[PDB]
Ligand binder design. Structure first.
Ligand SMILES: CC[C@@H]1C(=O)N(C)c2cnc(Nc3ccc(C(=O)NC4CCN(C)CC4)cc3OC)nc2N1C1CCCC1
Ligand SMILES: [Cl-]
Length: 110
């Protein structure tokens, strides 16, 4: 991994770590819409994303640069902001995890 992608990998490891789990857990794995009874989820969300998919993409060297990684993490949060009412607990969790992400992403070496 390039130096910028090492930083992205560090962020990802942090987002998956036990100290953020109280608000990160909804983002760990792909939404199982049928299991949750959300039969409109895949009509509304065209491009699902979650942290385990980001991790697999990192491991497989799919991301060619930090921008492509950031776009996927942000897509995950946007899906949450699109599907759920803005006062939902899951949205509050997203906002908190996105705060973790954006502040550390901004420290990217360059
Ligand atoms: C996809 C919509 C939105 C979102 O954006 N993401 C990312 C999401 C990701 N993961 C979840 N996951 C779970 C969400 C609720 C429950 C749950 O409450 N289960 C009960 C627990 C106690 N038991 C006696 C009966 C069942 C379990 C979940 O997975 C473990 N929910 C998400 N939500 C929420 C889904 C509907 C409201 C918002
Ligand atoms: Cl972006």
């Amino acid at each position: 991994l390039s130096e910028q992608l090492k930083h992205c990998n560090g962020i990802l490891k942090e987002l998956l770590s036990k100290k953020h789990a109280a608000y990160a857990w909804p983002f760990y794995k792909p939404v199982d819409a049928s299991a949750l009874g959300l039969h409109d989820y895949h009509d509304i969300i065209k491009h699902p994303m979650d942290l385990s998919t980001v991790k697999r993409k990192m491991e497989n060297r799919d991301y060619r640069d930090a921008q492509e990684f950031a776009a996927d993490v942000r897509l995950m949060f946007s899906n949450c902001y699109k599907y759920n009412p803005p006062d939902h607990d899951v949205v509050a969790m997203a906002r908190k995890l996105q705060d973790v992400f954006e502040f550390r992403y901004a420290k990217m070496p360059d």
